């Protein structure tokens, strides 16, 4: 009652090929749903559309979320990572929950408990991979509120179906904590590939030796010239002079077309095309927007003004509203770095013959809007950001391809387990506060590169300003001014 | 060999979100104020529980080859056509209509991770918009593998 | 080694992305190597 059950640990230890980041925050857990389990569906919200239909349950439990890179990395630590390294990935995890303080509306309740458990069998719906709000704050001095746990299951309209499963979280064993008890657990990340925090210094089509002719031939002329019966077969050899027709081993990665929207509003068509012109996929009669979708370059060289409609991850700025905010409020990320191995999001993949030519038939070629996997493709996954998620859960299925998640990060069959917490019902008006420390060990891949000229680095702006970036203003509000991608250093393709 | 999976998912691919929480991601919600010349703008909104079709997702449903809802889908080998049977694993019909079946038993347990057999995989832009040209799309009648897909095998 | 607890990110020495006829600190078409600008060593920061 008079002794502390834990201390405040925040730092980062950079050791050799590994990184160890520790973060401690203060939290507040209110009594969600008056200790009750309430069914929820679009009908409770009115159910305006079939695409927006849902069915599920809301629970009194809260949960801890630290699925964003900012919870573990300061802006200096993230700069230190992305400038010096070719790759990283999580190895170990440690979580601690301590200094429990229960209140009653305000006085203390010493005899109340707080139930906490982890699901290590992954028997509950995993909500930590959907990029939800409620994460531990970027700035250590912020006291944050724990998000409520709720899940969804099979629906038909607003109605349920027989196969729908119902989950009571009180049906798990859970540790109970008075003001002197503490909760802790350790997690081992399963083996995942290193995130590639680098940008290629070569393009897939330029891999050739520019000084030498190939020994392979292509068809240069099909006709001798103007006239009748001019048909001929003329084969020039592919070489430095014409690099477009050379024979190549590998082809660019897959594509799914997206609409290009200009950041200069005068350029955009004067019509409402946000949903009608969007690229989507359909599942059981419902059309879900394709967001962000497969990894593709945001734009062609020299066109940074445009961005794919849904193809980018768009964050908010500090104090930005929920609905219909102005364009200067958002932060749009560009994925140009992968432009060397990946097709542009807003461009077609290529062309294919649509017919057989003959003396009576001219050669026809149609555009390829989407191109799935082909033997010999290579591609780059989406980049990870300081504001973006870390891991995702690979859906348990008979098969998958390249399970790496589409919002970026590490696809894991057994990701970090969900951490469920709630106040014990006693009802008496009650809430609890306390401390949370999370510690992840990261693995690093150093660059041995022989590049002669200096790299591109992430750097703080040189010029004076009213505020300094990634710091509090005069009111005490902390704001992240920009997104920070991971890819600066370069490799050979 | 892998164990054959013998269970039906209770969760749809597009409904893995926490219904109670907003996403920190944004989407373009408005392109025009409307009903006038030069009414152009970019308005963005939080993807959230009220609009669940626009939210960002880490995984997308499996590959598909279209079938006629009940003209046969086919594959050519050495010039000789062949019916596609049974073909890739897909949902036999959309939920609520049990009378229709693919041209070539029901698989409906897999409709969570797999596209309906007789439905298009989705839509893709076919052009660049501009002030002169409106946006266009076109239906995807077949989709090979893409990274980030998940699917169920066929039931035994 | 740099031990700093500074929260916000540093100034760093970085190459500029904007396109150019030549690469900085590289040969030109004639074979002549050049050094574009003087590079000092002071970028990271310490307290006084």
């Amino acid at each position, epitope marked *: 009652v008079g002794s502390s059950s834990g201390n405040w640990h925040c730092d980062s230890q950079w050791l050799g090929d590994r990184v160890i980041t520790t973060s401690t925050r203060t939290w507040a857990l209110p009594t969600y749903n008056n200790h009750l389990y309430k069914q929820i569906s679009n009908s409770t919200s009115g159910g305006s559309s079939n695409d927006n239909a849902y069915f599920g349950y809301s629970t009194p439990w809260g949960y801890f979320d630290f699925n964003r890179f900012h919870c573990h990395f300061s802006p200096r630590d993230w700069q230190r990572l992305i400038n010096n390294n070719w790759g990283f990935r999580p190895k170990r995890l440690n979580f601690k929950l301590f200094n429990i303080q229960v209140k009653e509306v305000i006085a203390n309740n010493l005899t109340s408990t707080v139930q906490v458990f982890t699901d290590s069998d992954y028997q509950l719906p995993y909500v930590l991979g959907s990029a939800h709000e409620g994460c531990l704050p970027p700035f250590p001095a912020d006291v944050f509120m724990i998000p409520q746990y709720g899940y969804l299951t099979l629906n038909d309209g607003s109605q349920a179906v027989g196969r729908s499963s119902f989950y009571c979280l009180e049906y798990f064993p859970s540790q109970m904590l008075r003001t002197g008890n503490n909760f802790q657990f350790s997690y081992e990340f399963e083996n995942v590939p290193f995130h590639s925090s680098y940008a290629h210094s070569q393009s897939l089509d330029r891999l050739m030796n520019p000084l030498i002719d190939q020994y392979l031939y292509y068809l240069s002329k099909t006709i001798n010239g103007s006239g009748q019966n001019q048909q001929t077969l003329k084969f020039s050899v592919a070489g430095p002079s014409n690099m477009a027709v050379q024979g190549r081993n590998y082809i660019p990665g897959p594509s799914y077309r997206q609409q290009r929207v200009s950041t200069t509003v005068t350029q955009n068509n004067n019509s409402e095309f946000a949903w009608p012109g969007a690229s989507s996929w359909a599942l059981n009669g419902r059309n879900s927007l394709m967001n962000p979708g497969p990894a593709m370059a945001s734009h062609k060289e020299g066109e*940074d003004r445009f961005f794919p409609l849904s193809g980018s991850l768009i964050f908010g700025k500090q104090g930005t509203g929920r609905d219909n905010v102005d*364009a200067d409020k958002v*932060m749009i990320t*560009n994925e140009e770095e992968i432009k060397t191995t990946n097709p542009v999001a807003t461009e077609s993949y290529g062309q294919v013959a649509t017919n057989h030519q003959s003396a009576q038939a001219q050669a026809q070629t149609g555009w390829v809007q989407n191109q799935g996997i082909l033997p010999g493709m290579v591609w780059q996954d989406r980049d990870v950001y300081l504001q973006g998620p870390i891991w995702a859960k690979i859906p348990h299925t008979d098969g998958n391809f390249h399970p790496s998640p589409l919002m970026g990060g590490f696809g894991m069959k057994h990701p970090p387990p969900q951490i469920l917490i709630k106040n014990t019902p006693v009802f008496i008006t009650q809430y609890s506060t306390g401390q949370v420390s999370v510690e992840i060990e990261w693995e690093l891949q150093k660059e041995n590169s022989k590049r002669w000229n200096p790299e591109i680095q992430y750097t703080s702006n040189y*010029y004076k300003s009213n505020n300094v970036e990634f710091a509090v203003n005069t009111e005490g509000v902390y704001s992240e001014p920009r997104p920070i991608g991971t890819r600066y250093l370069t490799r050979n393709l | 060999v892998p164990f054959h999976s013998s269970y039906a998912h209770s969760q749809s691919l597009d409904r893995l979100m926490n219904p109670l929480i907003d996403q920190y991601l944004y989407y373009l919600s408005k392109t025009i*104020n409307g009903s006038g010349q030069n009414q*152009q703008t970019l308005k963005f909104s939080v993807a959230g529980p009220s609009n669940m079709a626009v939210q960002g997702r880490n995984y997308i449903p499996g590959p598909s080859y279209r079938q006629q809802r009940v003209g046969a889908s086919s594959w050519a080998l050495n010039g000789r056509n062949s019916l596609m049977n049974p073909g890739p694993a897909m949902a036999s019909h959309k939920e609520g209509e049990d009378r229709f079946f693919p041209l070539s038993t029901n698989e409906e347990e897999i409709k969570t991770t797999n596209p309906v057999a007789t439905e298009s995989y989705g839509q893709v832009a076919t052009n660049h918009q501009s002030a002169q040209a409106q946006a266009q799309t076109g239906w995807v009648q077949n989709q090979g593998i893409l990274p980030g897909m998940v699917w169920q095998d066929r039931d035994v | 080694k740099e031990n700093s607890k500074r929260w916000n990110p540093e100034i760093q020495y970085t190459s500029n992305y904007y396109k150019s006829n030549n690469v900085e600190f590289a040969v030109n078409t004639e074979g002549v190597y050049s050094e574009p600008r003087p590079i000092g060593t002071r970028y990271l920061t310490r307290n006084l």
Partner: antibody
Amino acid sequence: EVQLVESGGGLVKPGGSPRLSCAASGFNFGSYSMNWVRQAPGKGLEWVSSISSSSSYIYYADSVKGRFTISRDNAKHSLYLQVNSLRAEDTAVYYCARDPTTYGYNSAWDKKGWYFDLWGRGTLLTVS
Amino acid sequence: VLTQPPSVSAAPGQMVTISCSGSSSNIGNDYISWYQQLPGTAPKLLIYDNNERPSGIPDRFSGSKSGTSATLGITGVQTGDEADYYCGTWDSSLSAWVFGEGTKLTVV
């Protein structure tokens, strides 16, 4: 079609306070960044101030900084420049400039990349 | 600060080249635009995003940015093309928009 009209200009003695209103018509004034550019008689034009669509970002030139205030009204389709402590150097023709690009605030962090695609006729302001 | 030659003068049908030197903070860093102003009229945009040309602007006008300096090139000069020219960009050190000193083009 698209037009910008500047009014409020006239002859005012030094220390007087005037207010320059820029009325827009023909497009959606709510989604564009707005600017004030002045040109002193027989001299090159000078940028004065800028305001964002939501009027959250406001920049001033150093010469006018602290004595000039810029406000924008989206409902009345009007841009406002309030003037205080007028000085002889304040004689100019005040142009209302429109910036179509939002790219400085959402896609680029290092650079603004502004340009002015639409200009008002301008209103003269003389101090005597 | 953007620096332009105070005047340029060429006979009709002759190439005219107007260039304004800039510091690393402004021209090297940002896209530069060119504005041409007639004697009795307000400025009109000529070139934006270094080389891009607005609709209603003739092909003769062209622009390019190399290193810290951007040059506006006019070919097939005409009597009607005589007007003041300004190159402007956002300057990061100053944190304000800067216009060039101006360049008077005069055809004889």
